[PDB]
Each structure stands twice: as structure tokens, then as C-alpha cells.
Amino acid sequence: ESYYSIGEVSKLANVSIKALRYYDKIDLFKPAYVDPDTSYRYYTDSQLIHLDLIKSLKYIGTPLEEMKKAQDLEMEELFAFYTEQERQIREKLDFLSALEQTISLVKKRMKRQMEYPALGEVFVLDEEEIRIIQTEAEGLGPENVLNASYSKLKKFIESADGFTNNSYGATFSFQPYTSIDEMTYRHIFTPVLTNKQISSITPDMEITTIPKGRYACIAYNFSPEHYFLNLQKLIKYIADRQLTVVSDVYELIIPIHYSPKKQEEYRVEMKIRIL
Template sequence: MKEYFTIGETARLNNISIQTLRYYDRIGIFKPYYTDQENGYRYYHVKQFFYLDIIKYLKYIRTPLEEIKRFGSYTCTPEDIQHFLEEQESVIVQEMEKLERARQLLHRRRNQLNEQLDICRKKDEGFVYFRYLDEQTILKVETPQVNPHDQSDLYYRKLADVIEKIGDVVDNYYGFIYDFKPYKDSRDIYCNSIYTTVCNEKKIDIGEKNIRLDTIPSGEYVCIAFDWSAKNYDEYYQKLYQYIESHGIQTDGNVYQVSLPIDFNSLREENFLTELRVLKK
């Protein structure tokens, strides 16, 4: 029975490329049984194929090459192998959790973009409209002196920092909450808080006193949307306020402003779609 095989035969019998075998030889993970000194040909013994199967298995479970090299650099007992595989299982579980969070973020972002497209259609009509919103879990920071016209990026970064510390990514959805009143000028508005939505609230550990988790209630909201500008803000807020007052609509006393970026080019001037929401009671 044949015991020694060329690199081409070894590659074909083990469903692996010649280039991969050469690379494994070069970095010391899987070396040929011997190399012909006259012509440089590599030869592998049939008994080595078992170890190649182990390497392929470890690669399949996403073990880094450095770990595979370390694993094969000394004689392992079954206990050593068991401990090694337990470590790899832990790594895989962590990766699965990251992928699940990424899937949730992707799903939420797609829903937000669908919502944004719907708001854009409403904005083009220029009228007050009603829509039902599900309850939202939010992370918010108290901002007693912030006006909707002020730069609020630093407050938003505080929220992003809390979310990123648990391995999640903050999305592009952020808003303000302030009192629903008959403001003569939108520069008289002072926001109670700035918020963003979250999906892994159970894992959030908040260290700062003025940041906390909260919810925006579900229900029917009276809304108006516009392209953000100081002029538009005054005009559309007044239109929304007058509509609610003239129709005798009871509210929870808050305005929930949502801002969504329209342009994702960082070199251009900021361009936001804004929606003002007031919850009917």
C-alpha cells in the first residue's frame, strides 16, 4: 500500500489547495514528512492526513492560525484538547452574540429607513397628519439648557459612548423632548432631554447620573414634518400647535422631535428631516 504522497496528491485527496499546504509548511502548522533535497519536492505520509483533518476542523470552527500552531506545537492529552475546544466554543458563542446584535441593528435600521421614507412623503404634502407609533425604549440625557437650534452633538456623543461600551452601535436616530407650549419663537424652547433608541437595554450599564433609560409611549401622534431650518422650524411648529389647539386635542404635554439625516456625505452641509410629534391622550 502506498504510504507517501506528493503535495499535489495530498491536496487532491484532502480537498485542499497546493497553495494552502505550502503556506502551512512555511508558517510551521503542517509540514511534509520529508522534502527531497535534490529537487525540493514535498512528500507527506498517509498517517499525517489525520492531523490535516484536525487542522481543517479547527479552521471550520474559526480557530485562528496562531492558535492552531500553538495547539500543534506540543503533545496534547485528551484533557488538553477538551479544554482547548471549550475555549473555542466560548469564542464562537461570543461571535454569535455579536452577529445577533448586528442582525437586530440591521433590522431596526431598515425599519427606520422605511419610516423615514414615509415621513418624507408626508413632508412633501406639508400638512398635519396622524400616525400610530409603538412604544420605544430610549436612552436619554438631560439637557435643561439646550435649544433645538443649538449644537447638541456632544450630548449625543455621551449617549453613543454608553451604547458602544456594551459592544453595540448607535444609530442615526435621535430626538429632543420638550414641553408643548405656545412659543412665540422656537429659540424660546428649552429641551428636557436628548435621546436615541436602543434595542439591548438589559445590558446597558449607565454610569452617569443625568443619563437613563426611559420609554416613549405607544399611541396616536399628531405630527408634522419638514426639512430642518430655523425658518421652517418656527413655521411648522406654529402650524402644528394651532391645529392641535383649534381641534381641542388633548395631549400628554410633550413634543417629541425626531431628526434623521437625509444626506450621508460627511463633506456636505448637514441636511436633516425633522418630524414633530405630540401624543394624543
């Protein structure tokens, strides 16, 4: 007996003719006979048994050369191979569900931002804690901070989270500033999203957090005239209420879009904790 044409076989095993032809090319699964005159491929019924494995292995996802060597193994030998495949699967799963969580949180963070009570206005609210990696900003003012200034931070973040946080942060001493050049950042930082142990972290990186507590905040969209005014707004709010400050000012800058085809726009949030 009983001989199948490539088509017959295709229908039979549910494998594309192109597939079979290919698996012939790579000598993974060759027809039992090839008519020398017409180059036609013809297969034996007993032969189909091999596709059982080729197909299974394909479903798992093992690459073809891999199959080519796996098909040699005797049952004992193979069992092992299968346990290997298992661990690889669990690796993926671990990675994927990590990825599931981070996103959920990226969305949670991204949402609080799209639902902020109002812009250019100062609001006081109960905040949740936010872990971050920070580093001394060596006499670095909002005047000359660079993206390049964040690179090492972004490295450790990238390794741990895998997912470069949109957010850029810096903090400074809450003072009755009168102009931007009096301002200098104390540390700069990037919120961390993950609990994977950071690998091989250097000692110039403090892992620390923006504690939970009451924050006087303000959020707006960036425009230079506006930046210092909003600051002033905050200092005023606090001054009027007599409220007592207990942290630096936290500044967070997050893009609204990443289109290089449109004018770049950013969101800014200054937070500060009170009693």
C-alpha cells in the first residue's frame, strides 16, 4: 502493498505537501521511493509512524535538526529529552507570568495618570508606596539633566524588570526657591516594577522607596513657562496651610507618546509628603 503519493500522505497525516517535500530536503522524513523518471514522491504505510513524532515534536516547538537527532534515541534516552523539554516550558511560563504581572502594574501606573483630578492644580492625597532605584545626582539641576544621565539606572532596571520604565524621577530639597538655578537635584531615580533579585548591583545604587503617606501633589503637561510656576504653586499651598513637610520634592516626568512624527510632550508630577 500500500503506497501513498505525497498528496495522499498530506491528507492522511494532515501535513502540507510543501512540508513533506521540505522534510525530504533536510533528510528528516524521506519517501520510501522516488520515481527516477518523474521525481514523484511515494511513501509506505508503515512509514507514517515517523510523523507521529515529527508532528508531536513540532507541536512542542523543537527545531528540525533537533528532531533529526531525537528520532534516533531509544525510549529511555527519549524520556530524558522530554524532561528537558519540560524544564524549558517552566522557564517560559515563569517568564510569561512575570511579564503578565509587570504589565498589569504598568497599566495600573499608567491609569492613575490618565485619571488625575486636575492639572496645574494642587491636590493632597493618600499615596501608596513606590519602590525605586536612585543615585546621587552630582550637582545636577533640572536645567541640564540628560536622558544619558539615567543610563546606568536604566541598565539595572532593564535587567530586572526587562521592561524599561517610562518614568523619570529626580528629587530635591523643599525650599522657598526664587528661580530655577537655585534648584539642584539630590538624587535621580527610576521606579522599579519587579521583585526579581537585581543582579550584581553596584554600591552607588540605592534601592529605596517613596514611602506611603500623604502627599501634596500637582501634575501638568510640560511647558517651560509653567514649570517653575507650578513649583511656586506647591510651595504656596503648603505655606498657606502651614503644613509640615517630611520628604524632598519628587519630580516625575513621563512622555505622553513616543511618536517621532509629532511634537514631543511630557507629563510632570511634583509630589511631597506631609504630616
